[PDB]
Design a protein around this nucleic acid. Structure first.
Ligand SMILES: [K+]
Ligand SMILES: [K+]
Ligand SMILES: [K+]
Ligand SMILES: [K+]
Ligand SMILES: [Mg+2]
Ligand SMILES: [Mg+2]
Ligand SMILES: [Mg+2]
Ligand SMILES: [Mg+2]
Ligand SMILES: [Mg+2]
Ligand SMILES: [Mg+2]
Ligand SMILES: [Mg+2]
Ligand SMILES: [Mg+2]
Ligand SMILES: [Mg+2]
Ligand SMILES: [Mg+2]
Lengths: 98, 353, 158, 52, 193
RNA sequence: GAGUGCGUGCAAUAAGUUUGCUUUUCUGUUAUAAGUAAGUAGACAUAUAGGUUUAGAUGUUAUAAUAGGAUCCUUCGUAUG
RNA sequence: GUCCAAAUACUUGACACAUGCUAAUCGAACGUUUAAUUUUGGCUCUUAAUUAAAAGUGGUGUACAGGUGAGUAUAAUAUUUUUUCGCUUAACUUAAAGUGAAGGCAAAUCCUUCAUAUUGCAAAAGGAUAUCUAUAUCCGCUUUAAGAGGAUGAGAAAAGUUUCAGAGAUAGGUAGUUGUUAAGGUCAUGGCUUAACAAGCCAAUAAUUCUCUUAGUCGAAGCUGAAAAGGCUGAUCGACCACAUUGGGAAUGAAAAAAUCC
């Protein structure tokens, strides 16, 4: 089963992720089939922006990710939430309004 | 789970011969594991079984099994069941049906479809209606299913006759009404009573057994016999409840039972054809046997409901009663002398005793 | 559609000398040239190779100079075929049986393979035919019995 | 699905989700094969152009 | 933002809420002075009060969110409860002249089903009728023919944690072996010596 | 003189296991035999009855042939000498 | 020898191991078992149920992850490029059709078997929730056609690549083995298989075989030189191989790829 998931890298208290295409039953950090992108969870801040707004840097090869979702790849919950923001899949969870 | 079948109460030697024959060769083998049960019917192991016969510990005492010629030694189940059933003459004897039918159920013996209707008659007439109602309740063990339109019609016949035999007294009519309802609830809810033989008969009648107008008339009879007695405060709170059901059931029967249609025209024309499906109703002897209480129920209900001020029902029930009476009178003319039906109808409807 | 024709492709041409002949039928050993590069010394060494070549008409003799072509599989160890004789040995070329052209050798493979398929379709149709006959006879013995038993019942309901 | 081609509504909330997921995989596969094809053509043209 | 949901007849106070979800959370029933404190305290505040281990605090925050969203457990949709006991009865309708639809409704213990109005004749989810006059569903104990009670019980809504038998798969044969040794050794002390 | 996680020969050998002028047994087809046990069809009659009788197309039972799988035996075979 | 962060941390005895943990999960697959609760018959016993627990049966997973370097001395049905291909009964993705009948165990989505499924051989399993004053759904099961994936077939053809430890001995090796004819098999090729003939084929400087010693292999992975197809190492990282006290083995399964099993 191919999966679009994250490979935890970095150092202690400095997480960094690789968006990868790997078989489900393999080691988390083993060499995958492809590296589709990267994901940094800690939000950053523009250098000369004093407004206080934060952002998150995410590099993603949308063209390569769409092909794997088209052939039957199963993204994890975290990668699903990311792919839903860019506008590829529908969200799995939503804030209840009532 | 259940105790091993046993027949330790027999008033006649003939009965003991038939029950012990089936027990030692048709029932007991069913308690062995599936492997050993194959050796008993295999010539290749005839020699071995002669020396060390298969044994099973029942009540401690082992039961030895030797080779059995599947063709020459096996007994005839239908005939042995008949020899036993005909020799039962005491309550201690009929108590074996619970174990007998259990053993046949274990052996997967496809008994005659009519066998149930026969056991109900010969047992109930002897005054053992409870033994039947107990086997029906314990259908998970005895396999005594209510899958035939005749068995249900035969069972409900005695449940009323016992109440009618006491002039419809409150202690008994209350008891009968509990039994009739327990059957209509088992036919509807309990799934043990459903089979292909029942789905076919329900397609010919187009009424499910728990709604068949012929069976609902039984519950209407006993109900109509409870309100007639009064229609003490505790009795009043209860008597007032019987009238609520009377108008409830009566108003339901008229909705199912079509107009100006008797017992022989109620169901489809294809229902009375097959001898395995509701053909017994053609013989005048068996028609008067079931159209007696049903005719008496519609008449009685039509009177009480009329007193309460229900014009429609007072005329609807008389419509059916008039239809069943016209047909019932024909059977009374075609029936031969000295038959059961001619006597029952003469006693219930004729009131000659 | 169902004909699997050979590739019919032309590969390179190698010149060599015939080392042995007459030992096996339609087969000779031909020595060709070659050169393998040594990466440690950074030089080339003569790397001659001897192959078993296919001689269809047995028209080659030892000491003969011929031109061979690979890619013509004939056996487990024969992947080369004789293209033409460069310099004969012993007798002239015209005094030896001719060497068929690659087209003639390829046409034989297609013709031989095509005939093999025709032999199969017949053996398959006949096998399936003689099988349906037995399956058809069983339907007869089972029908005459059923018909005889079913018509009897229908005859007792008139 | 034969039902979707006929123009029928979703039978239940589960099938409605299967319709959206199936469509998302169709739209992404089309955009994926075309997007990855233009990359190949654009990559081969550059090599064939510089090698010439 | 921290909207508080109104109590329900089946979960009227905090002690009842903590008793249902289980996980031995009724110990901390005294930390929450009011029903509004339960649905207002934060992760850091629950940690100071002493709601621990972290597994119980995160489990509480989870069920706290479910209650807001209305994702009650079983029996949470009841409307006629008294001292924590609810009675379930059967309501029969004639769907056709040869059929009858039976629904497990919740009505006061005194009023009969046919007497109640459509407004108060609540239909509890998760409970059905088997055949006739039989109510089937978790924690539905029978009271009489066609009646069953549903009382508040410890861990009624609990997400039971999985447990090992004889130490799991890896240590199954060994725990049974050593246990068999203790048995034989005991018999020797009883009858052997 | 002492040891040897070494190779090898011969004998022996558990698990497992090849072959066939081994031996039992199960199952599936094919052709028969029976219809008493079962099970499936048809005929006739009785009536508080549900009996008598016949039948094999589907099942069941038996035999033969044939196919295959499990047994046993044979062969090979750790330990061990 | 004051503080902080990151990173690394039994290199030796694959030596022996106290104790707790590293693989479980599904009650919407299945009944048992006692507990109370409620109903039958009899007059405490005895029926039929509900509910909750505890062991199990079945499905999937323990073929992944994690650990170690004892054994292991290599050119191989190894590997790269282009052309041409084949196989795939589990899981993933899209769709279609079919989801009937008995028996065994206490019961079953377990086991055995049947009907039906272009011709004729060849399948399946049921469970669950709503609506009304039987219908429609949810999760599965079997088959079929595809995509992806793959540990896949000796795939094949053409042209290449592979620094193969140290020392010593050994000149023969190969018996479908080499070739031809014919036939079968194969998508195709190939003694791959078979019959009949021929005596070949590989090697000659060690092809082949054997003994001893040592070792997990590899990478700009680590250290190092200005540099060499550099040298050394083979920790942490990734890939591959092997092993799970030592030795000898098989089955299951789509596939041994198990800390399983004998
Ligand atoms: K030996
Ligand atoms: K031996
Ligand atoms: K592993
Ligand atoms: K090693
Ligand atoms: Mg030179
Ligand atoms: Mg042996
Ligand atoms: Mg007979
Ligand atoms: Mg030895
Ligand atoms: Mg170490
Ligand atoms: Mg290593
Ligand atoms: Mg079915
Ligand atoms: Mg080239
Ligand atoms: Mg060979
Ligand atoms: Mg070593």
């Amino acid at each position: 089963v191919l999966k679009l998931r994250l490979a935890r890298f970095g150092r202690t208290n400095a997480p960094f992720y690789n968006i990868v295409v790997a078989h489900a039953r393999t080691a988390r950090n083993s060499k995958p089939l492809e590296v589709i992108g990267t994901y940094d969870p800690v939000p950053k801040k523009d250098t000369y922006d004093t407004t206080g707004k934060l952002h998150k840097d995410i590099k993603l090869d949308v063209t390569r990710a769409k092909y794997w979702i088209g052939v039957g790849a199963q993204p994890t919950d975290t990668v699903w939430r990311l792919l839903s923001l860019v506008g590829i899949l529908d969200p799995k969870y939503k804030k209840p309004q009532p | 789970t259940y105790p091993v079948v046993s027949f330790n109460k027999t008033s006649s030697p003939e009965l003991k011969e038939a029950l012990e024959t089936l027990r030692e060769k048709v029932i007991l083998p069913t308690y062995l594991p599936p492997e050993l049960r194959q050796k008993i019917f295999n010539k290749k192991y005839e020699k071995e079984l002669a020396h060390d016969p298969v044994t099973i510990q029942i009540d401690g005492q082992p039961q030895r099994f030797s080779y059995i010629n599947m063709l020459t030694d096996m007994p005839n189940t239908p005939k042995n069941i008949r020899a036993a059933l005909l020799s039962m003459k005491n309550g201690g004897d009929f108590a074996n049906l619970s174990g007998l039918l259990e053993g046949m159920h274990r052996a997967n013996r496809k008994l005659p479809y009519w066998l149930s209707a026969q056991i109900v008659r010969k047992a109930c007439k002897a005054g053992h209606l409870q033994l039947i109602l107990n086997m029906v309740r314990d259908v998970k063990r005895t396999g005594f299913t209510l899958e035939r339109h005749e068995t249900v019609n035969e069972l409900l016949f005695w449940i009323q006759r016992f109440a009618w035999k006491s002039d419809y007294s409150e202690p008994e009519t209350r008891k009968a009404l509990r039994e009739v309802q327990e059957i209509l609830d088992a036919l509807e809810g309990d799934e043990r009573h459903m089979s292909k033989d029942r789905k076919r008969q329900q397609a010919l009648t187009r009424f499910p057994y728990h709604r068949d107008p012929q069976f609902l008339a039984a519950r209407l009879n006993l109900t109509a016999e409870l309100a007639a007695r009064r229609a003490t405060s505790e009795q009043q709170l209860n008597s007032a409840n019987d009238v609520k059901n009377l108008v409830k059931y009566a108003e339901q029967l008229v909705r199912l039972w079509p107009a100006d249609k008797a017992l022989l025209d109620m169901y489809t024309d294809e229902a009375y054809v097959a001898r395995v499906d509701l053909r017994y109703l053609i013989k005048p002897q068996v028609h008067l046997r079931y159209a007696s209480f049903t005719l008496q129920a519609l008449k009685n209900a039509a009177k009480i409901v009329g007193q309460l001020g229900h014009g429609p029902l007072a005329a609807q029930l008389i419509n059916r009663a008039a239809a069943v009476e016209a047909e019932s009178q024909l059977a009374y003319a075609k029936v031969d002398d000295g038959m059961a039906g001619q006597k029952i109808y003469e006693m219930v409807v004729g009131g000659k005793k | 559609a169902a004909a699997t024709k050979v590739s019919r492709k032309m590969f390179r041409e190698l010149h060599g000398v015939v080392v042995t002949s007459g030992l096996i039928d339609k087969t000779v050993k031909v020595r060709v040239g070659g050169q393998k590069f040594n990466k440690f010394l950074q030089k080339h060494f003569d790397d001659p190779k001897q192959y078993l070549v296919h001689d269809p008409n047995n028209s080659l003799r030892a000491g003969d100079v011929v031109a061979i072509m690979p890619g013509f599989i004939t056996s487990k160890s024969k992947r080369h075929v004789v293209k033409h004789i460069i310099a004969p040995a012993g007798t002239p070329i015209e005094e030896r049986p001719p060497i068929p052209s690659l087209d003639e050798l390829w046409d034989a493979k297609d013709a031989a393979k095509a005939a093999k398929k025709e032999r199969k379709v017949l053996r398959e149709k006949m096998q399936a035919a003689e099988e349906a006959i037995e399956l058809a006879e069983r339907m007869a013995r089972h029908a005459v019995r059923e018909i005889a038993m079913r018509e009897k019942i229908i005859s007792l309901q008139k | 699905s034969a039902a979707e081609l006929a123009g029928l509504p979703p039978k239940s909330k589960q099938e409605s989700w299967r319709r959206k997921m199936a469509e998302a995989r169709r739209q992404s596969l089309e955009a994926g094969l075309q997007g990855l094809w233009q990359r190949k053509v654009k990559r081969d043209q550059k090599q064939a152009k510089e090698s010439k | 933002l921290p909207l508080i949901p109104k109590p329900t007849p089946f979960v009227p106070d905090v002690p009842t809420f903590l008793t249902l979800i289980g996980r031995d959370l009724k110990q901390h029933a005294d930390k929450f002075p009011t029903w509004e404190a339960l649905f207002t305290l934060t992760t850091d505040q629950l940690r100071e009060l002493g709601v621990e281990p972290p597994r119980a605090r995160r489990y509480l925050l989870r069920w706290r969110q479910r209650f807001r969203e209305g994702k009650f457990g079983i029996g949470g949709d009841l409307k006629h409860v008294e001292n924590g006991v609810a009675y379930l009865k059967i309501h029969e309708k004639e769907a056709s002249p040869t059929r009858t639809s039976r629904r497990v409704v919740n009505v006061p213990a005194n009023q009969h089903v046919e007497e109640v109005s459509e407004g108060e004749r609540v239909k509890v989810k998760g409970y059905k009728v088997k055949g006739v006059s039989t109510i089937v569903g978790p924690y539905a104990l029978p009271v009489q023919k066609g009646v069953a009670k549903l009382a508040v019980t410890e861990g009624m809504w609990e997400d039971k944690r999985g447990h090992k038998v004889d130490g799991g798969e890896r240590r199954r044969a060994e725990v049974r072996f050593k246990r068999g040794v203790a048995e034989r050794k005991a018999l020797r002390e009883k009858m052997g010596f």
